[PDB]
């Protein structure tokens, strides 16, 4: 059974930092990519980037929207995905979904329940 559990959500103030976590299971972690998609309350989904798998070299990619500020890393041993965020701008706020990606179906076939981020002064 595939499981993706995100965590580390809550109130923060802009410019600060926040570390989002995403535990996995039920599949060979290193066999797949791992993407981060976010959805601002009342808005559409946004792909932030992924981290490739073992065969590719666990290299990372980012959308122009978050490139530089956010950085993605993984922990193959424990099979845990991470999103290191920097300068939590007012439009950074939203529910953050980690997902299972790759070049097999070229899609995110498994998603987590997400973790909410709210930026309040």
């Amino acid at each position: 059974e595939v499981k993706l559990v995100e965590s580390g959500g809550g109130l923060v103030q802009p410019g600060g930092s926040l570390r989002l976590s995403c535990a996995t299971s039920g599949f060979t972690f290193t066999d797949y990519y791992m993407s981060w998609v976010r959805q601002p309350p009342g808005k559409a989904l946004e792909w932030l980037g992924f981290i490739r798998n073992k065969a590719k070299g666990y290299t990372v990619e980012y959308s122009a929207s978050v490139k530089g500020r956010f950085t993605i890393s993984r922990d193959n041993s424990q099979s845990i995905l991470y999103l290191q965020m920097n300068t939590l701008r007012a439009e950074d706020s939203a529910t953050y979904y980690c997902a299972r990606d790759g070049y097999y179906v070229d899609a995110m076939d498994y998603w987590g329940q997400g973790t909410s981020v709210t930026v309040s002064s």
């Binding site: 559409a44 989904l45 792909w47 992924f50 179906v105 899609a107």
Partner: protein, 112 residues
């Protein structure tokens, strides 16, 4: 900077009916190598996490009911739901995975 425009923005319908919705692309999403259209449709019920419905334009994901049918290629794609059930109420996103990933604005489905 691939841009995916979905039409319409929203659409309400009664259960059991047949609906279509459009996904329009900026660049061709067709790969001449494996001859695959790098586009996927995603279902997201209100307050829940998104779910893969279809990939490679027409390939239905495992478990997804037969009434969900995806079609099109290049820049033009559509999602067809033959006999909309109550469970179907949700926002539908098309996504290009031709170069990294990009989601459309989404098409919201209502059931009255």
């Amino acid at each position: 900077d691939i841009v995916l425009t979905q039409s319409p923005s929203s659409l309400a319908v009664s259960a059991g009916e047949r609906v279509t919705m459009s996904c329009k692309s900026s660049q061709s999403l067709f790969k001449s190598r494996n001859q695959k259209n790098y586009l996927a449709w995603y279902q997201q019920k209100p307050g829940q996490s998104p779910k893969l419905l279809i990939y490679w334009a027409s390939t239905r994901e495992s478990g997804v009911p037969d009434r969900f049918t995806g079609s099109g290629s290049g820049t033009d794609f559509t999602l067809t739901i033959n006999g909309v059930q109550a469970e179907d109420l949700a926002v539908y996103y098309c996504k290009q995975s031709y170069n990294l990933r990009t989601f459309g604005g989404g098409t919201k489905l209502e059931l009255k």
